PDB file of C-alpha atoms and ligand atoms in Angstrom:
ATOM      1  CA  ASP A 141       0.349  61.574  51.249  1.00  0.00           C
ATOM      2  CA  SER A 142       3.584  59.702  50.907  1.00  0.00           C
ATOM      3  CA  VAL A 143       1.339  56.396  50.246  1.00  0.00           C
ATOM      4  CA  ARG A 144       1.278  57.407  46.625  1.00  0.00           C
ATOM      5  CA  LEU A 145       5.343  58.466  46.908  1.00  0.00           C
ATOM      6  CA  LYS A 146       6.446  55.404  47.952  1.00  0.00           C
ATOM      7  CA  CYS A 147       4.213  53.122  45.872  1.00  0.00           C
ATOM      8  CA  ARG A 148       5.363  55.070  42.592  1.00  0.00           C
ATOM      9  CA  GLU A 149       9.269  54.761  43.561  1.00  0.00           C
ATOM     10  CA  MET A 150       8.760  50.928  43.755  1.00  0.00           C
ATOM     11  CA  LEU A 151       6.593  50.840  40.367  1.00  0.00           C
ATOM     12  CA  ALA A 152       9.802  52.727  39.261  1.00  0.00           C
ATOM     13  CA  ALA A 153      12.223  49.817  40.722  1.00  0.00           C
ATOM     14  CA  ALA A 154      10.343  47.243  39.074  1.00  0.00           C
ATOM     15  CA  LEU A 155      10.610  49.336  35.563  1.00  0.00           C
ATOM     16  CA  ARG A 156      14.546  48.595  35.773  1.00  0.00           C
ATOM     17  CA  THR A 157      14.412  44.983  36.209  1.00  0.00           C
ATOM     18  CA  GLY A 158      17.248  43.646  34.130  1.00  0.00           C
ATOM     19  CA  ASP A 159      18.335  46.662  32.626  1.00  0.00           C
ATOM     20  CA  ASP A 160      15.750  46.346  29.531  1.00  0.00           C
ATOM     21  CA  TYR A 161      15.358  50.382  30.775  1.00  0.00           C
ATOM     22  CA  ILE A 162      18.879  51.107  29.886  1.00  0.00           C
ATOM     23  CA  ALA A 163      19.245  49.007  27.341  1.00  0.00           C
ATOM     24  CA  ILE A 164      16.228  50.559  25.082  1.00  0.00           C
ATOM     25  CA  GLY A 165      17.510  53.788  26.945  1.00  0.00           C
ATOM     26  CA  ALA A 166      14.692  55.516  28.363  1.00  0.00           C
ATOM     27  CA  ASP A 167      14.567  57.063  31.916  1.00  0.00           C
ATOM     28  CA  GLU A 168      12.051  54.654  33.831  1.00  0.00           C
ATOM     29  CA  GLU A 169      11.199  57.195  36.998  1.00  0.00           C
ATOM     30  CA  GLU A 170       9.377  59.841  34.983  1.00  0.00           C
ATOM     31  CA  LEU A 171       7.385  56.436  33.913  1.00  0.00           C
ATOM     32  CA  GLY A 172       7.032  55.283  37.208  1.00  0.00           C
ATOM     33  CA  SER A 173       5.449  58.623  39.037  1.00  0.00           C
ATOM     34  CA  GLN A 174       3.057  58.673  35.621  1.00  0.00           C
ATOM     35  CA  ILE A 175       1.844  55.305  35.947  1.00  0.00           C
ATOM     36  CA  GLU A 176       0.650  55.421  39.447  1.00  0.00           C
ATOM     37  CA  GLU A 177      -0.975  59.420  38.965  1.00  0.00           C
ATOM     38  CA  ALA A 178      -2.329  56.947  35.265  1.00  0.00           C
ATOM     39  CA  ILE A 179      -4.052  54.564  37.843  1.00  0.00           C
ATOM     40  CA  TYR A 180      -4.888  56.987  40.931  1.00  0.00           C
ATOM     41  CA  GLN A 181      -6.837  58.777  38.044  1.00  0.00           C
ATOM     42  CA  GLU A 182      -8.552  55.882  37.249  1.00  0.00           C
ATOM     43  CA  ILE A 183      -9.033  54.349  41.107  1.00  0.00           C
ATOM     44  CA  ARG A 184      -9.754  58.127  42.393  1.00  0.00           C
ATOM     45  CA  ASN A 185      -9.366  57.123  46.218  1.00  0.00           C
ATOM     46  CA  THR A 186      -7.142  58.601  48.338  1.00  0.00           C
ATOM     47  CA  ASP A 187      -6.384  55.524  49.890  1.00  0.00           C
ATOM     48  CA  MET A 188      -5.847  53.570  46.813  1.00  0.00           C
ATOM     49  CA  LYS A 189      -8.717  51.170  48.089  1.00  0.00           C
ATOM     50  CA  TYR A 190      -7.838  49.194  44.151  1.00  0.00           C
ATOM     51  CA  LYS A 191      -3.909  49.894  44.750  1.00  0.00           C
ATOM     52  CA  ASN A 192      -3.783  45.717  43.505  1.00  0.00           C
ATOM     53  CA  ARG A 193      -3.157  47.909  40.579  1.00  0.00           C
ATOM     54  CA  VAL A 194       0.028  49.522  41.461  1.00  0.00           C
ATOM     55  CA  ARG A 195       1.376  45.858  43.364  1.00  0.00           C
ATOM     56  CA  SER A 196       0.141  44.059  40.084  1.00  0.00           C
ATOM     57  CA  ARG A 197       2.108  46.781  37.987  1.00  0.00           C
ATOM     58  CA  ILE A 198       5.171  46.441  39.983  1.00  0.00           C
ATOM     59  CA  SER A 199       4.742  42.370  39.586  1.00  0.00           C
ATOM     60  CA  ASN A 200       3.996  42.100  36.649  1.00  0.00           C
ATOM     61  CA  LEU A 201       6.998  44.643  35.096  1.00  0.00           C
ATOM     62  CA  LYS A 202       9.119  42.177  37.566  1.00  0.00           C
ATOM     63  CA  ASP A 203       7.680  39.182  36.122  1.00  0.00           C
ATOM     64  CA  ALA A 204      10.460  37.663  34.077  1.00  0.00           C
ATOM     65  CA  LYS A 205       9.070  35.341  31.094  1.00  0.00           C
ATOM     66  CA  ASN A 206       7.213  38.703  30.176  1.00  0.00           C
ATOM     67  CA  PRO A 207       9.680  40.968  30.079  1.00  0.00           C
ATOM     68  CA  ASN A 208       8.301  42.072  27.111  1.00  0.00           C
ATOM     69  CA  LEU A 209       6.009  44.515  29.149  1.00  0.00           C
ATOM     70  CA  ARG A 210       8.879  46.182  31.069  1.00  0.00           C
ATOM     71  CA  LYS A 211      10.468  46.678  27.353  1.00  0.00           C
ATOM     72  CA  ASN A 212       7.622  48.431  26.015  1.00  0.00           C
ATOM     73  CA  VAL A 213       7.246  51.635  28.087  1.00  0.00           C
ATOM     74  CA  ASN A 217       5.581  51.798  22.826  1.00  0.00           C
ATOM     75  CA  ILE A 218       1.909  51.469  24.800  1.00  0.00           C
ATOM     76  CA  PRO A 219       2.009  54.220  27.149  1.00  0.00           C
ATOM     77  CA  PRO A 220       1.391  54.389  30.870  1.00  0.00           C
ATOM     78  CA  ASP A 221      -1.698  55.589  30.371  1.00  0.00           C
ATOM     79  CA  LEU A 222      -2.728  52.422  28.768  1.00  0.00           C
ATOM     80  CA  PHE A 223      -1.070  50.208  31.022  1.00  0.00           C
ATOM     81  CA  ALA A 224      -2.667  51.165  33.829  1.00  0.00           C
ATOM     82  CA  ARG A 225      -6.235  49.932  33.170  1.00  0.00           C
ATOM     83  CA  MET A 226      -5.505  46.602  31.309  1.00  0.00           C
ATOM     84  CA  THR A 227      -7.342  43.642  32.196  1.00  0.00           C
ATOM     85  CA  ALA A 228      -4.996  40.366  33.173  1.00  0.00           C
ATOM     86  CA  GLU A 229      -2.533  43.152  34.460  1.00  0.00           C
ATOM     87  CA  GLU A 230      -1.508  43.994  31.199  1.00  0.00           C
ATOM     88  CA  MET A 231      -0.351  40.119  30.719  1.00  0.00           C
ATOM     89  CA  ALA A 232      -2.142  39.310  27.736  1.00  0.00           C
ATOM     90  CA  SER A 233       1.594  40.691  26.174  1.00  0.00           C
ATOM     91  CA  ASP A 234       2.897  37.336  27.491  1.00  0.00           C
ATOM     92  CA  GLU A 235       1.427  35.650  24.553  1.00  0.00           C
ATOM     93  CA  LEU A 236       2.577  31.894  26.254  1.00  0.00           C
ATOM     94  CA  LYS A 237       0.316  32.457  29.360  1.00  0.00           C
ATOM     95  CA  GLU A 238      -2.222  34.088  27.328  1.00  0.00           C
ATOM     96  CA  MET A 239      -2.089  30.913  24.625  1.00  0.00           C
ATOM     97  CA  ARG A 240      -2.073  29.169  27.708  1.00  0.00           C
ATOM     98  CA  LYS A 241      -5.316  30.474  29.298  1.00  0.00           C
ATOM     99  CA  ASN A 242      -7.118  30.377  25.726  1.00  0.00           C
TER     100      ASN A 242
ATOM    101  CA  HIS B1163     -22.344  26.236  41.210  1.00  0.00           C
ATOM    102  CA  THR B1164     -18.609  27.395  41.978  1.00  0.00           C
ATOM    103  CA  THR B1165     -17.122  26.872  45.740  1.00  0.00           C
ATOM    104  CA  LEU B1166     -13.981  27.479  46.384  1.00  0.00           C
ATOM    105  CA  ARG B1167     -13.509  23.366  46.115  1.00  0.00           C
ATOM    106  CA  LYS B1168     -13.656  23.315  43.014  1.00  0.00           C
ATOM    107  CA  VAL B1169     -10.917  25.716  41.593  1.00  0.00           C
ATOM    108  CA  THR B1170      -8.715  24.552  44.068  1.00  0.00           C
ATOM    109  CA  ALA B1171      -5.870  22.186  43.161  1.00  0.00           C
ATOM    110  CA  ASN B1172      -4.599  21.545  47.017  1.00  0.00           C
ATOM    111  CA  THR B1173      -4.844  23.573  50.432  1.00  0.00           C
ATOM    112  CA  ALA B1174      -2.203  22.797  53.132  1.00  0.00           C
ATOM    113  CA  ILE B1175      -1.937  24.779  56.909  1.00  0.00           C
ATOM    114  CA  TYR B1176       1.232  26.061  57.820  1.00  0.00           C
ATOM    115  CA  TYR B1177       2.893  27.899  60.849  1.00  0.00           C
ATOM    116  CA  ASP B1178       4.267  30.897  58.643  1.00  0.00           C
ATOM    117  CA  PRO B1179       5.717  33.249  61.574  1.00  0.00           C
ATOM    118  CA  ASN B1180       7.275  35.734  58.850  1.00  0.00           C
ATOM    119  CA  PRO B1181       6.601  36.014  55.223  1.00  0.00           C
ATOM    120  CA  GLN B1182       9.483  37.567  54.451  1.00  0.00           C
ATOM    121  CA  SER B1183      11.062  34.088  54.885  1.00  0.00           C
ATOM    122  CA  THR B1184       7.970  31.980  53.934  1.00  0.00           C
ATOM    123  CA  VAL B1185       8.030  27.980  54.462  1.00  0.00           C
ATOM    124  CA  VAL B1186       6.511  27.249  50.966  1.00  0.00           C
ATOM    125  CA  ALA B1187      10.122  28.669  48.351  1.00  0.00           C
ATOM    126  CA  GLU B1188       7.478  28.369  45.848  1.00  0.00           C
ATOM    127  CA  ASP B1189       5.654  31.834  47.289  1.00  0.00           C
ATOM    128  CA  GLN B1190       8.534  32.890  49.059  1.00  0.00           C
ATOM    129  CA  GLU B1191       9.260  35.505  45.743  1.00  0.00           C
ATOM    130  CA  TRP B1192       5.895  36.421  44.845  1.00  0.00           C
ATOM    131  CA  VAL B1193       4.808  36.588  48.681  1.00  0.00           C
ATOM    132  CA  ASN B1194       7.586  39.494  48.778  1.00  0.00           C
ATOM    133  CA  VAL B1195       5.930  41.506  47.105  1.00  0.00           C
ATOM    134  CA  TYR B1196       2.826  41.599  49.096  1.00  0.00           C
ATOM    135  CA  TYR B1197       5.552  42.027  51.431  1.00  0.00           C
ATOM    136  CA  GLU B1198       7.815  44.162  50.497  1.00  0.00           C
ATOM    137  CA  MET B1199       5.161  46.865  50.604  1.00  0.00           C
ATOM    138  CA  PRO B1200       3.056  45.798  53.029  1.00  0.00           C
ATOM    139  CA  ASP B1201      -0.725  47.228  53.047  1.00  0.00           C
ATOM    140  CA  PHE B1202      -1.507  45.540  56.549  1.00  0.00           C
ATOM    141  CA  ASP B1203       0.079  45.396  59.077  1.00  0.00           C
ATOM    142  CA  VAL B1204       2.570  42.427  59.966  1.00  0.00           C
ATOM    143  CA  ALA B1205       1.590  42.229  63.738  1.00  0.00           C
ATOM    144  CA  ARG B1206      -2.043  41.169  62.802  1.00  0.00           C
ATOM    145  CA  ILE B1207      -1.036  38.488  60.280  1.00  0.00           C
ATOM    146  CA  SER B1208      -1.597  35.489  62.333  1.00  0.00           C
ATOM    147  CA  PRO B1209       1.728  33.171  61.657  1.00  0.00           C
ATOM    148  CA  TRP B1210      -0.647  30.101  61.332  1.00  0.00           C
ATOM    149  CA  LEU B1211      -1.238  29.791  57.416  1.00  0.00           C
ATOM    150  CA  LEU B1212      -4.219  28.164  55.240  1.00  0.00           C
ATOM    151  CA  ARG B1213      -2.306  27.826  51.948  1.00  0.00           C
ATOM    152  CA  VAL B1214      -4.868  27.246  48.913  1.00  0.00           C
ATOM    153  CA  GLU B1215      -3.313  26.742  45.470  1.00  0.00           C
ATOM    154  CA  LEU B1216      -5.476  26.888  42.172  1.00  0.00           C
ATOM    155  CA  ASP B1217      -5.932  24.706  39.050  1.00  0.00           C
ATOM    156  CA  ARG B1218      -5.451  27.139  36.214  1.00  0.00           C
ATOM    157  CA  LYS B1219      -8.036  24.623  34.238  1.00  0.00           C
ATOM    158  CA  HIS B1220     -10.775  25.131  36.878  1.00  0.00           C
ATOM    159  CA  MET B1221      -9.888  29.214  37.169  1.00  0.00           C
ATOM    160  CA  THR B1222      -9.632  29.932  33.451  1.00  0.00           C
ATOM    161  CA  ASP B1223     -11.874  27.577  32.456  1.00  0.00           C
ATOM    162  CA  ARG B1224     -14.444  30.205  34.127  1.00  0.00           C
ATOM    163  CA  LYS B1225     -12.053  33.009  33.985  1.00  0.00           C
ATOM    164  CA  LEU B1226     -12.056  33.272  37.675  1.00  0.00           C
ATOM    165  CA  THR B1227      -9.246  35.667  39.166  1.00  0.00           C
ATOM    166  CA  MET B1228      -7.253  35.581  42.368  1.00  0.00           C
ATOM    167  CA  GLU B1229      -8.560  39.209  43.138  1.00  0.00           C
ATOM    168  CA  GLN B1230     -12.138  37.660  43.230  1.00  0.00           C
ATOM    169  CA  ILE B1231     -11.175  34.952  45.482  1.00  0.00           C
ATOM    170  CA  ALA B1232      -9.603  37.264  48.548  1.00  0.00           C
ATOM    171  CA  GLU B1233     -12.890  40.004  47.974  1.00  0.00           C
ATOM    172  CA  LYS B1234     -14.975  36.776  48.284  1.00  0.00           C
ATOM    173  CA  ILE B1235     -13.503  35.003  51.279  1.00  0.00           C
ATOM    174  CA  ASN B1236     -13.268  38.532  53.442  1.00  0.00           C
ATOM    175  CA  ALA B1237     -16.638  39.109  53.556  1.00  0.00           C
ATOM    176  CA  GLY B1238     -17.720  35.392  54.175  1.00  0.00           C
ATOM    177  CA  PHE B1239     -15.943  35.609  57.222  1.00  0.00           C
ATOM    178  CA  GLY B1240     -14.417  39.048  57.862  1.00  0.00           C
ATOM    179  CA  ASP B1241     -11.753  41.282  59.822  1.00  0.00           C
ATOM    180  CA  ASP B1242     -11.104  38.228  61.321  1.00  0.00           C
ATOM    181  CA  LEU B1243      -9.838  36.674  58.080  1.00  0.00           C
ATOM    182  CA  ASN B1244      -6.595  38.341  55.983  1.00  0.00           C
ATOM    183  CA  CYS B1245      -6.476  36.567  52.711  1.00  0.00           C
ATOM    184  CA  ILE B1246      -3.201  37.507  50.309  1.00  0.00           C
ATOM    185  CA  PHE B1247      -2.885  35.981  47.045  1.00  0.00           C
ATOM    186  CA  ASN B1248      -0.718  35.276  44.200  1.00  0.00           C
ATOM    187  CA  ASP B1249      -0.637  37.702  40.697  1.00  0.00           C
ATOM    188  CA  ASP B1250      -2.636  36.469  37.802  1.00  0.00           C
ATOM    189  CA  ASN B1251      -0.172  36.208  35.810  1.00  0.00           C
ATOM    190  CA  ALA B1252       2.021  34.578  37.600  1.00  0.00           C
ATOM    191  CA  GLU B1253       2.901  30.909  36.871  1.00  0.00           C
ATOM    192  CA  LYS B1254       0.843  29.330  40.463  1.00  0.00           C
ATOM    193  CA  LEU B1255      -2.890  30.014  41.328  1.00  0.00           C
ATOM    194  CA  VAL B1256      -1.706  29.937  44.928  1.00  0.00           C
ATOM    195  CA  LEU B1257      -3.657  31.623  48.066  1.00  0.00           C
ATOM    196  CA  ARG B1258      -2.805  32.547  51.594  1.00  0.00           C
ATOM    197  CA  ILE B1259      -5.235  33.547  54.274  1.00  0.00           C
ATOM    198  CA  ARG B1260      -4.171  34.309  57.562  1.00  0.00           C
ATOM    199  CA  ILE B1261      -6.076  34.891  60.422  1.00  0.00           C
ATOM    200  CA  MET B1262      -6.462  38.573  61.488  1.00  0.00           C
ATOM    201  CA  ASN B1263      -5.521  39.238  65.019  1.00  0.00           C
TER     202      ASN B1263
ATOM    203  CA  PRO C   9       3.995  20.882  51.056  1.00  0.00           C
ATOM    204  CA  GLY C  10       4.968  17.672  52.618  1.00  0.00           C
ATOM    205  CA  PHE C  11       2.989  15.270  54.812  1.00  0.00           C
ATOM    206  CA  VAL C  12       2.249  15.062  58.746  1.00  0.00           C
ATOM    207  CA  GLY C  13       1.976  11.915  60.617  1.00  0.00           C
ATOM    208  CA  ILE C  14       0.951  11.014  63.756  1.00  0.00           C
ATOM    209  CA  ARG C  15       4.060  10.918  66.409  1.00  0.00           C
ATOM    210  CA  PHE C  16       3.257   9.505  69.857  1.00  0.00           C
ATOM    211  CA  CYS C  17       4.446  10.217  73.133  1.00  0.00           C
ATOM    212  CA  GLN C  18       7.405   8.699  74.282  1.00  0.00           C
ATOM    213  CA  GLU C  19       6.317   9.239  77.866  1.00  0.00           C
ATOM    214  CA  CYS C  20       2.791   7.757  77.277  1.00  0.00           C
ATOM    215  CA  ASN C  21       2.776   6.534  73.559  1.00  0.00           C
ATOM    216  CA  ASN C  22      -0.067   8.851  73.470  1.00  0.00           C
ATOM    217  CA  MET C  23      -0.338  11.328  70.208  1.00  0.00           C
ATOM    218  CA  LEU C  24       1.272  14.100  69.822  1.00  0.00           C
ATOM    219  CA  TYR C  25       0.386  17.296  68.440  1.00  0.00           C
ATOM    220  CA  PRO C  26       1.274  20.912  67.090  1.00  0.00           C
ATOM    221  CA  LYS C  27       1.748  23.941  69.359  1.00  0.00           C
ATOM    222  CA  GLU C  28       3.882  26.810  68.094  1.00  0.00           C
ATOM    223  CA  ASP C  29       6.237  28.605  70.712  1.00  0.00           C
ATOM    224  CA  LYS C  30       4.255  31.796  71.469  1.00  0.00           C
ATOM    225  CA  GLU C  31       7.476  33.599  72.560  1.00  0.00           C
ATOM    226  CA  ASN C  32      10.145  32.083  69.849  1.00  0.00           C
ATOM    227  CA  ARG C  33       7.369  32.497  67.259  1.00  0.00           C
ATOM    228  CA  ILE C  34       7.669  28.536  66.460  1.00  0.00           C
ATOM    229  CA  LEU C  35       6.540  25.308  65.929  1.00  0.00           C
ATOM    230  CA  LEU C  36       6.742  23.146  68.804  1.00  0.00           C
ATOM    231  CA  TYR C  37       4.786  19.453  69.120  1.00  0.00           C
ATOM    232  CA  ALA C  38       3.218  18.176  72.792  1.00  0.00           C
ATOM    233  CA  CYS C  39       1.682  15.403  74.335  1.00  0.00           C
ATOM    234  CA  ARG C  40      -2.011  16.552  74.863  1.00  0.00           C
ATOM    235  CA  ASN C  41      -1.892  14.450  78.568  1.00  0.00           C
ATOM    236  CA  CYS C  42       1.701  15.151  80.008  1.00  0.00           C
ATOM    237  CA  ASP C  43       3.898  18.208  79.581  1.00  0.00           C
ATOM    238  CA  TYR C  44       6.384  15.969  76.828  1.00  0.00           C
ATOM    239  CA  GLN C  45       7.148  18.100  73.947  1.00  0.00           C
ATOM    240  CA  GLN C  46       9.580  18.242  71.385  1.00  0.00           C
ATOM    241  CA  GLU C  47      10.243  21.169  68.678  1.00  0.00           C
ATOM    242  CA  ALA C  48       8.117  20.873  64.765  1.00  0.00           C
ATOM    243  CA  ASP C  49      10.041  19.086  61.993  1.00  0.00           C
ATOM    244  CA  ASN C  50       7.910  19.769  58.939  1.00  0.00           C
ATOM    245  CA  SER C  51       6.468  24.116  59.760  1.00  0.00           C
ATOM    246  CA  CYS C  52       3.580  22.849  58.075  1.00  0.00           C
ATOM    247  CA  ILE C  53       0.300  21.875  60.190  1.00  0.00           C
ATOM    248  CA  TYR C  54      -1.732  20.206  57.642  1.00  0.00           C
ATOM    249  CA  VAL C  55      -1.822  19.452  54.362  1.00  0.00           C
ATOM    250  CA  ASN C  56      -4.791  18.513  52.190  1.00  0.00           C
ATOM    251  CA  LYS C  57      -4.969  17.048  48.258  1.00  0.00           C
ATOM    252  CA  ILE C  58      -7.872  18.814  46.704  1.00  0.00           C
ATOM    253  CA  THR C  59      -6.763  17.133  43.539  1.00  0.00           C
ATOM    254  CA  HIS C  60      -5.805  13.828  44.972  1.00  0.00           C
ATOM    255  CA  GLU C  61      -2.613  13.619  43.444  1.00  0.00           C
ATOM    256  CA  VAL C  62      -1.321  10.810  44.730  1.00  0.00           C
ATOM    257  CA  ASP C  63       1.940   8.182  44.499  1.00  0.00           C
ATOM    258  CA  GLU C  64      -0.238   5.111  43.528  1.00  0.00           C
ATOM    259  CA  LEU C  65       3.146   2.778  43.694  1.00  0.00           C
ATOM    260  CA  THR C  66       2.612   3.230  47.160  1.00  0.00           C
ATOM    261  CA  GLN C  67      -0.882   1.057  47.592  1.00  0.00           C
ATOM    262  CA  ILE C  68       0.641  -1.171  44.897  1.00  0.00           C
ATOM    263  CA  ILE C  69       2.135  -4.149  46.219  1.00  0.00           C
ATOM    264  CA  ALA C  70       4.701  -6.547  44.505  1.00  0.00           C
ATOM    265  CA  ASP C  71       3.119  -9.286  46.166  1.00  0.00           C
ATOM    266  CA  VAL C  72      -0.267  -8.729  42.999  1.00  0.00           C
ATOM    267  CA  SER C  73       2.891  -9.937  41.024  1.00  0.00           C
ATOM    268  CA  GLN C  74       1.838 -13.922  41.646  1.00  0.00           C
ATOM    269  CA  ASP C  75      -1.669 -13.267  40.872  1.00  0.00           C
ATOM    270  CA  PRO C  76      -2.996 -15.513  38.663  1.00  0.00           C
ATOM    271  CA  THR C  77      -6.389 -13.992  37.718  1.00  0.00           C
ATOM    272  CA  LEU C  78      -3.792 -11.262  37.018  1.00  0.00           C
ATOM    273  CA  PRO C  79      -3.669 -10.904  32.941  1.00  0.00           C
ATOM    274  CA  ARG C  80      -0.091 -11.134  31.604  1.00  0.00           C
ATOM    275  CA  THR C  81       2.222  -9.216  28.452  1.00  0.00           C
ATOM    276  CA  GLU C  82       5.403 -11.289  26.914  1.00  0.00           C
ATOM    277  CA  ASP C  83       4.876  -7.432  24.977  1.00  0.00           C
ATOM    278  CA  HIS C  84       6.511  -5.665  27.662  1.00  0.00           C
ATOM    279  CA  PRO C  85       9.654  -7.232  29.209  1.00  0.00           C
ATOM    280  CA  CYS C  86      10.654  -5.837  33.146  1.00  0.00           C
ATOM    281  CA  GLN C  87      12.179  -2.392  32.940  1.00  0.00           C
ATOM    282  CA  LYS C  88      14.282  -4.165  36.006  1.00  0.00           C
ATOM    283  CA  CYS C  89      15.196  -7.658  35.188  1.00  0.00           C
ATOM    284  CA  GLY C  90      13.960  -7.157  31.563  1.00  0.00           C
ATOM    285  CA  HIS C  91      11.592 -10.561  32.105  1.00  0.00           C
ATOM    286  CA  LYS C  92       8.982 -10.921  29.108  1.00  0.00           C
ATOM    287  CA  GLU C  93       6.271 -11.531  31.224  1.00  0.00           C
ATOM    288  CA  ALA C  94       4.604  -8.949  33.155  1.00  0.00           C
ATOM    289  CA  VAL C  95       1.075  -8.635  34.641  1.00  0.00           C
ATOM    290  CA  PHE C  96      -1.053  -5.305  34.131  1.00  0.00           C
ATOM    291  CA  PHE C  97      -4.098  -3.702  35.671  1.00  0.00           C
ATOM    292  CA  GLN C  98      -5.988  -0.132  36.656  1.00  0.00           C
ATOM    293  CA  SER C  99      -5.704   1.592  39.823  1.00  0.00           C
ATOM    294  CA  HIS C 100      -8.244   1.135  42.123  1.00  0.00           C
ATOM    295  CA  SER C 101      -8.190   4.180  44.076  1.00  0.00           C
ATOM    296  CA  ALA C 102     -11.565   6.987  43.637  1.00  0.00           C
ATOM    297  CA  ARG C 103      -9.403   9.411  41.456  1.00  0.00           C
ATOM    298  CA  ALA C 104      -6.551   6.825  39.916  1.00  0.00           C
ATOM    299  CA  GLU C 105     -10.295   4.899  38.811  1.00  0.00           C
ATOM    300  CA  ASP C 106     -11.495   7.800  37.314  1.00  0.00           C
ATOM    301  CA  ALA C 107      -8.300   8.139  35.694  1.00  0.00           C
ATOM    302  CA  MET C 108      -8.376   3.963  34.730  1.00  0.00           C
ATOM    303  CA  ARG C 109      -4.381   4.713  34.250  1.00  0.00           C
ATOM    304  CA  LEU C 110      -2.560   1.101  33.649  1.00  0.00           C
ATOM    305  CA  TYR C 111      -0.137  -0.252  35.787  1.00  0.00           C
ATOM    306  CA  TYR C 112       2.069  -3.043  35.056  1.00  0.00           C
ATOM    307  CA  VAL C 113       4.234  -5.713  37.238  1.00  0.00           C
ATOM    308  CA  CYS C 114       6.842  -8.023  36.583  1.00  0.00           C
ATOM    309  CA  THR C 115       6.095 -11.857  36.513  1.00  0.00           C
ATOM    310  CA  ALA C 116       8.772 -12.585  38.282  1.00  0.00           C
ATOM    311  CA  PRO C 117       9.795 -13.414  42.043  1.00  0.00           C
ATOM    312  CA  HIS C 118      12.059 -11.110  43.902  1.00  0.00           C
ATOM    313  CA  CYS C 119      12.200  -8.701  41.164  1.00  0.00           C
ATOM    314  CA  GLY C 120       8.263  -7.926  41.196  1.00  0.00           C
ATOM    315  CA  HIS C 121       9.123  -4.602  39.305  1.00  0.00           C
ATOM    316  CA  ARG C 122       5.918  -2.566  39.602  1.00  0.00           C
ATOM    317  CA  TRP C 123       5.778   0.503  37.278  1.00  0.00           C
ATOM    318  CA  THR C 124       3.168   2.704  34.697  1.00  0.00           C
ATOM    319  CA  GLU C 125       4.058   3.692  31.211  1.00  0.00           C
TER     320      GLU C 125
HETATM  321 ZN1  LIG D   1       2.641  12.080  76.971  1.00  0.00          ZN
HETATM  322 ZN1  LIG D   2      11.461  -8.222  36.395  1.00  0.00          ZN
END
């Protein structure tokens, strides 16, 4: 269904923020389409009842205080899609504040 | 025993008829994430908004998350009560509760 | 968030309450008696500070500067007028009282400058 298509297109649109994908020189549409699959293969319901995963990956890629996460995608998508704290442990300043 | 009162910083009720131009500037950029790909129809979100902003100390002190709070509130009242919340990685822990039409 | 306050009807001087413009989807203020009505200024219906974040300065008053039962310090010249003598005391408000935070006021007339450090 198009539900997966639009939300992984939005994942690709999140990966490109700040031209970091171009500074690194990587193709982000493949990455977004793979990230949505990595999420779905764990949250395996058709309507993605827990699409908090996708919404949060989108936003956290767009989080300007943790651009290093946007840079990393070298931790592959298969790991990113599952991360607790929505992967913002990599921010390492919010992580220290929470600690 | 930890109720919504212990983790909340402040609460406010607003007439916020359009989240894509929400009355709170602090929330507009993160509300856009929830409204640029809405998982709900703009016609069922009531324009009346109850904003609850949480203390990161009282949330992190006990590892609480925006997801838990929204899930809990949706269960305590129900279909008549929509809940939106800021991302756990964002700077401000904010909840945006709206009556569902 | 701001702070909404009571407004009185120009017709009956009774308190005015917020009402939504069901058509234009905006906020209105209306008298519960007469149809006196006006468009609302805050977009906020209500606020409730759970933390009780408060501008203690609003409840502090300069008149306390002459209280003879108030401790005075020559050690803290007035930030406004520089006068050496200043009275100091704690913020007797439940959350401010729990914080035990001190407030200083100048012991100089018409100055009455009150500050916290
Ligand atoms: Zn009236
Ligand atoms: Zn002075």
